[PDB]
RNA sequence: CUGCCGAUAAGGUCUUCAAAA
RNA sequence: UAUUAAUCUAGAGUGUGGUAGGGAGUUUUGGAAUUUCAUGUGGAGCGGUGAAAUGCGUAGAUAUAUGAAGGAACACCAGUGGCGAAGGCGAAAACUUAGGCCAUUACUGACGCUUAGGCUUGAAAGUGUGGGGAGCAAAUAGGAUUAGAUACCCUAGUAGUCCACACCGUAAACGAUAGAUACUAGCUGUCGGGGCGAUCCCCUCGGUAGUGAAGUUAACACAUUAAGUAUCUCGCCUGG
């Protein structure tokens, strides 16, 4: 699998914390792939936990077997230098199969490009953008659909016998009943 | 008066995925002034996205990134 | 639920505070009485239907 | 989860025969083995019991079907799979 | 006998002599209604107004008060029948 | 002739057709389709000879593995059908076998009773003429 | 804007009718 | 029709490829709020009601600020919604795991529907053993009301509500509508997959709703998710 930890180390000193993260990484993770690490920075987290107001956020994008979680999970709490820890297994988050499909990825790039074009005209440099068309409806249908529209699997069948067919056609419904008026 | 501009952003962009450290400033818009997940009438996303963002923001609210009851 | 007075006027603060307290009072009074879970869902479903039908005609 | 690919390739009578009865029972036995482990470990998950009972009943009917038609291959499958007992 | 200018929302059984036509355009109705009136005037032996006539005499005007819009809207004036308890 | 829709049928071959004809009569529908079997083809051939339906065409695929018969009903000018009511005798479970002495007469001969004695499906009048009876499929009047 | 607020013996009529004017 | 000897894939399954879910169990984690306790400020009521009285309070209560402990349930999201055969499922994560939808030039080739007996699950209350107990509250005590109050109101209050393992197997367990299969106008919503490519909207295949004609019904009403036209199988009914 592909995991992603968001570790919460205390706010002591930068250089020594990075060492704490390397220590927390190299002890556990029995079997692992490449462990790329970043460093989002220093932020003042919202609610004070462990009586600390500053913390260093580390993100790990390693990958490995299911056993890589157990030892790390039971050791994080014991270590006084870690405030919280979340193992977000990204193979179960709300939407991953669509993200691996290549065709859906290119559409997202195209949607980004086209949407950026619309926002630009609206927030025009100084000239007034009269249409201000965004949330509103679009123009006539897309001719792309009209043509590339699917065709039902038209199973082709061949006639073998016949009898009595004459296609008379009696499509004259709700016709007039009365015909010509008369006097007794 | 009102507006009909209540429309899911992520649809026009096809973001297809919500991660709390990719559009963090975006999620603060969905939240209320008192750190609450605004409903559809205010937030504007389609139900499918509204569920995905809700899980991510509460996950963010568990990882201690956004307040609970105050600003 | 902090709202700043802005120190320009007082009424405006109470014009916003009336709204904030009403939505606050709804949940404050809700977690005052115990209904069975089935009855609890009924009042939740009841309020949504009232708000929906009311919202249809002003839109 | 079980490596479905390896088990099917063993039970193939010939290539592209990805839908016979013999391949089905081999796949079914593997799922039964896995589910018996899981259910014994948990003992309070009853939907897995529903799945286990449904799979067991489905396996019984298909092998019974294979007894009415072409009984000799039923003999071949049972000695390899050891499912009777 | 009853004749009518049905407009796609009518039960065809009730009318006998159906005359597929509009009913919302203040121009189509008058042209067709006068046409039946034109038969009556010819049967009564007074000169016709619109029937059996060339281009120049059929011109009629669009009443006051791009193209004309025969769209049916005002759907918001159809809420759910008052219910709930 | 082509279609666009999937064609399905019931497992019981007499009442499957019976539902199709009755529903088409009731819904004022004209053209319906179903899968082809030799009994249904045979009952329709005697049916069209007696004049309850106008045309009845059975078709087959280009691979010769499936056949579907698409029949139409014989409506008069005023759009009221010629069939009035259909009722099945040899229901599943209870197979109806009747000798000649108890061969039914439907509406004093106005309707037709379908009896497949020994030479495929066969009308009541000719069954009386041959003085031989057997399986009775359905009543159509 | 929620005080309080209980009881009521048995059996009973009444549509004669449209034949019709 | 039944039996036997065989062929075919459209029924039903399998695989590959798309894919939505509060589906389940096990193990960990989190914040508000209530209660109790600890420490400050403070100084006479608090509490409760239709109105009051038991009750709590100068032994410093209610209130306010901080901290600690502990148990239970998971606001907002949350729906003219989703999942499961039903009961049911809504803080976050990991592991294990069930079924389902769409497209299939693939495969087996009737292997399918129902099911007496049997087995599995089955809200809450209740039981047995061992833990747990913050809040609430059957039984119980007191104060009210009342002609009387063993009740409605209030103040206390045990079992219980919670967990593990064993039972009990009943509910208005309801859509008061058994399951399966084929057909029968339409309109408006909403959800998922697929096709196009800003959404929006259009089409296809399904799930979940509203309106609605033929048709059915004693009527109310049902009406493509039937209580309509028909078939199979099971369960059940025969006045109070
Ligand atoms: Mg009184
Ligand atoms: Mg505290
Ligand atoms: Mg219980
Ligand atoms: Mg007492
Ligand atoms: Mg109390
Ligand atoms: Mg008890
Ligand atoms: Mg019962
Ligand atoms: Mg209705
Ligand atoms: Mg009796
Ligand atoms: Zn969206």
D78-CA/H115-C1' distance, Å: 29
F60, F70, F72, F75: which to substitute to probe chain A, counting the most A Cβ within 10 Å? F60
8-state DSSP, F100: G
Give E16's strand partners: none
User: D70 vs D65, D81, D82, CA distance in Å?
Assistant: 9, 17, 19
Cβ atoms of residues F1 and F70 within 8 Å: yes
Whole-angstrom distance, CA of residue F75 vs CA of residue F54: 8
Question: C33: CA distance to ligand 1 center in Å?
Answer: 30
Q: Does the beta carbon of A93 lie under 8 angstroms from any beta carbon of chain B?
A: yes
Q: After which residues is chain F broken (C to N over 2.5 A)?
A: none
Q: Quote the CA–CA distance of A59 and B44 in Å, as a whole number.
A: 31
* Alpha carbon distance F141, F123 (integer Å): 12
With beta carbons under 8 A apart, name residues in chain B contacting A94. Answer: 18, 51-52, 55-56
Contact call for C1 and B34, based on CB within 8 A: yes
- What are the two backbone dihedrals, phi and then psi, of residue A87, each rounded to the nearest 5 degrees? -100, 90
The Cα–Cα gap between A4 and F6 comes to 48
Query: Which residues of chain F make contact with A152, given a CB cutoff of 8 A?
Result: 4
Q: What is the spatial distance between Cα E71 and Cα E3, in angstroms, rounded to a whole number?
A: 25
Phi-psi region of F134 (alpha: psi -120 to 50; beta: other; left: phi over 0): left
From the CA of A112 to the C1' of H196: give the distance in Å. 17
- In C, minimum Cα distance to E80 occurs at C53
Method: cryo-EM
- Got the DSSP string for A55-110? EEEEEE--B--GGGTHHHHHHHHHSTTEEEEEE--TTSSS--HHHH-HHHHHHHHH
Residue from C42, C43, C57, C59 to probe the interface with E (highest E Cβ count within 10 Å): C57
Q: At D61, is the secondary structure helix, strand, or coil?
A: helix
Give the span between the Cα atoms of F96 and F70, in whole angstroms: 28
Q: Which residue has the tokens 């189509």?
A: E28
**Interchain proximity B64–A99, CB inside 8 Å:** no
The partner residues of C32 in beta bridges, in order of sequence, read none
Query: What is the CA(A11)–ligand 6 centre distance, in A?
Result: 53
Does the beta carbon of C1 lie under 8 angstroms from any beta carbon of chain B? yes
Nucleic acid strand H: bases within 7 A of protein CB? 1, 8-11, 13-16, 18-26, 28-32, 75-81, 84-86, 89-99, 104, 106-108, 110-112, 120-122, 136, 165-166, 181-185, 190-192, 194-204, 210, 214-215, 228-233
Of residues E58, C12, B52, F115, the one with CA closest to residue A98: B52
Task: Please tell me chain F's helix, strand, coil percentages from 3-state DSSP, rounded to the nearest 5.
Answer: 30, 30, 40
Q: Which residues neighbour F97 within 8 Å (Cβ) at sequence distance 6 or greater?
A: F134, F135, F136
Chain A residues with CB under 8 Å of E16 CB are: 176-178
The answer to whether the beta carbons of residues F16 and F32 sit under 8 Å apart is no
Cβ atoms A29, A3 nearer than 8 A: no
First to last CA, chain E: 49
Angle at which helices D46-68 and D22-42 pack, to 10 degrees?
150
Report how many Cβ contacts below 8 Å link chain A to chain E.
9
F:71-100 residues touching chain A, CB 8 A cutoff: 75, 77, 79
- Backbone dihedral angles phi then psi of residue A6, each to the nearest 5 degrees: -120, 95
Protein-to-nucleotide distance from the CA of C39 to the C1' of H176, whole angstroms:
20
Resolution (A): 3.7
Question: Percent helix, strand, coil in chain A (nearest 5)?
Answer: 30, 20, 50
DSSP H or E run through D48: helix D46-68
CB distance A162 to F65 below 8 Å: no
Distance of alpha carbon E83 from alpha carbon F26, whole angstroms? 36
Residues of C in contact with B70 (CB under 8 A): 2
CA gap E36, A13 in Å, rounded = 98
Backbone angles phi, psi at D70, to 5 degrees: 60, 70
Residues in chain D: 85
Burial class (CB in 10 A: 0-12, 13-18, 19+), B26: middle
Rounded distance, CA F28 to CA F40, Å?
22
For residue A41, the cross-strand partners are A57
Q: 3-state class of F136 per DSSP?
A: strand
D23, D11 Cβ separation under 8 angstroms: yes
Total residue count of chain A as it appears in this document: 184
- Tracing tokens 């839109």 back to the chain, one arrives at C59
Interface of E to A at Cβ within 8 Å reads 1, 12-13, 15-18
Candidate from A40, A96, A118 with C-beta closest to B21 = A40
The Å distance, Cα C36 to ligand 3 centre, comes to: 14
d(CA D29, CA D63): 12
Interface A–B counts its CB contacts (< 8 A) at: 61
- Distance CA(C46)–CA(C58), nearest Å, equals 19
| Residue D7 burial by Cβ neighbours in a 10 Å radius (0-12, 13-18, 19+) | middle
Q: Which burial class, exposed, middle or buried, applies to D27 when counting CB atoms under 10 A from its CB (0-12, 13-18, 19+)? A: middle
Count of other CB atoms within 10 angstroms of residue F5: 7
The residue of chain B with its CA nearest to that of C51 is B41
Distance (Å) from CA A49 to ligand 2 centroid: 14
């Amino acid at each position: 699998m592909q995991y992603n930890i968001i570790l919460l180390v205390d706010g002591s000193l930068s250089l020594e914390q990075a060492n704490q993260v390397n220590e927390k990484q190299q002890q556990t993770l029995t079997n692992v792939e490449g462990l790329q690490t970043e460093y989002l920075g220093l932020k003042e987290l919202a609610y004070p936990i462990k009586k600390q107001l500053s913390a260093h956020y580390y993100r790990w994008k390693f990958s490995g077997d299911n056993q890589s979680t157990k030892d790390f999970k039971r050791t994080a709490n014991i270590n006084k230098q870690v405030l919280r820890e979340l193992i977000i297994n990204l193979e179960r988050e709300y939407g991953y199969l669509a993200s691996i499909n290549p065709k859906k990825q290119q559409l997202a790039l195209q949607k980004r490009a086209k949407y950026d074009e619309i926002i630009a005209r609206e927030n025009n440099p100084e000239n007034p953008d009269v249409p201000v068309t965004s949330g509103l409806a679009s123009t006539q249908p897309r001719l792309s659909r009209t043509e590339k529209a699917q065709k039902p699997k038209e199973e082709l069948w061949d006639v073998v016998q016949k009898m009595g067919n004459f296609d008379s056609v009696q499509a004259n419904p709700y016709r007039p009943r009365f015909k010509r008026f008369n006097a007794e | 008066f009102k507006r009909s501009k209540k429309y899911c952003r992520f649809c026009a962009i096809g973001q297809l995925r919500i991660d709390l450290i990719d559009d963090l400033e975006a999620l603060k818009r969905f939240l209320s002034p008192y750190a609450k997940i605004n409903p559809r009438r205010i937030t504007g996303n389609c139900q499918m996205h509204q569920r995905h963002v809700a899980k991510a923001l509460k996950r963010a609210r568990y990882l201690a990134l956004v307040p609970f009851v105050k600003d | 639920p902090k709202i700043e007075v802005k120190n320009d006027d007082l009424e405006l603060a109470l014009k916003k505070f009336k709204r904030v307290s009403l939505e606050i009072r709804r949940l404050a009074q809700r977690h005052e009485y115990h209904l069975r879970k089935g009855m609890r869902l009924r009042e939740k479903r009841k309020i949504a239907q009232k708000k929906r039908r009311k919202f249809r005609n002003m839109v | 989860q079980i490596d479905k690919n390896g088990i099917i390739k063993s039970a193939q009578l010939h290539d592209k025969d990805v839908g016979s009865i013999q391949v089905q029972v081999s796949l079914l036995t593997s799922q039964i083995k896995q589910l018996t482990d899981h259910l014994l470990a948990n003992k309070k998950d009853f939907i897995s019991k529903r799945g286990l009972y449904a799979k067991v009943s489905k396996r019984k009917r298909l092998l019974k079907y294979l007894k009415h038609n072409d009984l000799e291959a039923y003999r071949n499958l049972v000695k390899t799979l050891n499912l009777r007992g | 006998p009853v004749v009518a200018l049905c407009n796609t929302n009518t039960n065809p059984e009730l009318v006998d002599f159906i005359i597929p036509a509009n009913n919302h355009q203040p121009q189509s109705t008058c042209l067709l209604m006068n046409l039946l009136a034109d038969a009556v005037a010819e049967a009564k032996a007074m000169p016709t107004m619109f029937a059996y006539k060339p281009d120049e005499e059929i011109q009629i005007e669009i009443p006051q008060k791009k193209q004309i819009t025969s769209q049916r809207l005002n759907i918001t004036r159809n809420p759910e029948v008052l219910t709930r308890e | 002739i082509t279609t666009t829709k999937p064609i399905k049928a019931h497992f019981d071959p007499v009442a499957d057709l019976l539902t199709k004809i009755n529903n088409a009569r009731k819904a004022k529908l004209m053209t319906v389709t179903t899968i082809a079997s030799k009994l249904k083809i045979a009952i329709l051939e005697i049916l069209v000879k007696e004049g309850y339906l106008a045309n009845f065409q059975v078709l087959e695929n280009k691979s010769k593995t499936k056949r579907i018969v698409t029949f139409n009903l014989k409506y008069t000018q005023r759009r009221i059908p010629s069939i009035n009511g259909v009722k099945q005798i040899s229901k599943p479970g209870l197979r109806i076998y009747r000798p000649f002495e108890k061969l039914p007469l439907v509406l004093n001969g106005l309707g037709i009773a379908i009896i497949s004695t020994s030479d495929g499906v066969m009308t009541d009048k000719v069954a009386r003429l041959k003085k031989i009876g057997g399986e009775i499929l359905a009543y159509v009047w």
